[PDB]
Amino acid sequence: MAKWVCKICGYIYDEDAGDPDNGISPGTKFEELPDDWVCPICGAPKSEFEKLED
């Protein structure tokens, strides 16, 4: 699945990993993260992530 970078801190949201510590099962696409999900490292909103693809 895809990977997304937090433009602020460099955390990688890896769709294959999800974010289970913060309520997100492995396999959850970035689009499906709740609107108020934030970077677990720096707190940046979803707007600050960039999909790692051309």
User: Residue length, the chain?
Assistant: 54
Which of 5, 8, 17, 38 touches Fe ion (CB under 5 A)?
A: 8
Q: Are 14 and 8 in contact (CB under 8 A)?
A: no
5 counts as binding Fe ion under rule CB under 5 A: no
Q: Which two tokens stand for residue 16?
A: 């294959």
Task: Provide, rounded to whole angstroms, the least separation between the CB of residue 12 and Fe ion.
Answer: 10
Window contacting Fe ion (CB under 5 A); options: 12-20, 21-29, 35-43: 35-43
Which of 11, 14, 17, 30 touches Fe ion (CB under 5 A)?
A: 11
> Looking at 1-54, which runs of residues are DSSP E strands?
3-6, 12-14, 49-51
